[PDB]
Write a protein that binds this ligand. Structure first.
Ligand code: NAG
Lengths: 50, 49
């Protein structure tokens, strides 16, 4: 519905090698007037080239 | 309030409104809290006895 919605909730993960159990509520963080066609996406990480 | 029309008593309440939340729907899905557009305050909506 012509909207881009992003939800986030920062949690202090304890000594677990993977995603921990329990629960977490992703609070709404921002909403934007979007509506461009979306089919794919890609993440960005910092390559070590210092 | 912001187009939402009704009758009630606007009494200040201690409801823990999260920043994104705006409304105060109850167990029976009834409006019970609104946020003033001018100043951010949580007002309890209660029908007259
Ligand atoms: C988005 O682009 C894809 C790939 O061309 C196309 O098949 C699809 O119909 C488009 N979606 C919208 C909502 O325009």
């Amino acid at each position: 519905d012509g909207y881009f919605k992003i939800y986030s909730k920062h949690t202090p993960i304890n000594l677990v090698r993977d995603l921990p159990q329990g629960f977490s509520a992703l609070e709404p963080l921002v909403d934007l007037p979007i509506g461009i066609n979306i089919t794919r996406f890609q993440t960005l990480l910092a390559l070590h080239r210092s | 309030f912001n187009g939402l029309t009704g009758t009630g008593v606007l009494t200040e309440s201690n409801k823990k409104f999260l920043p994104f939340q705006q409304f105060g729907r109850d167990i029976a899905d009834t409006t019970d809290a609104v946020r003033d557009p001018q100043t951010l305050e949580i007002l309890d909506i209660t029908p007259c006895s």
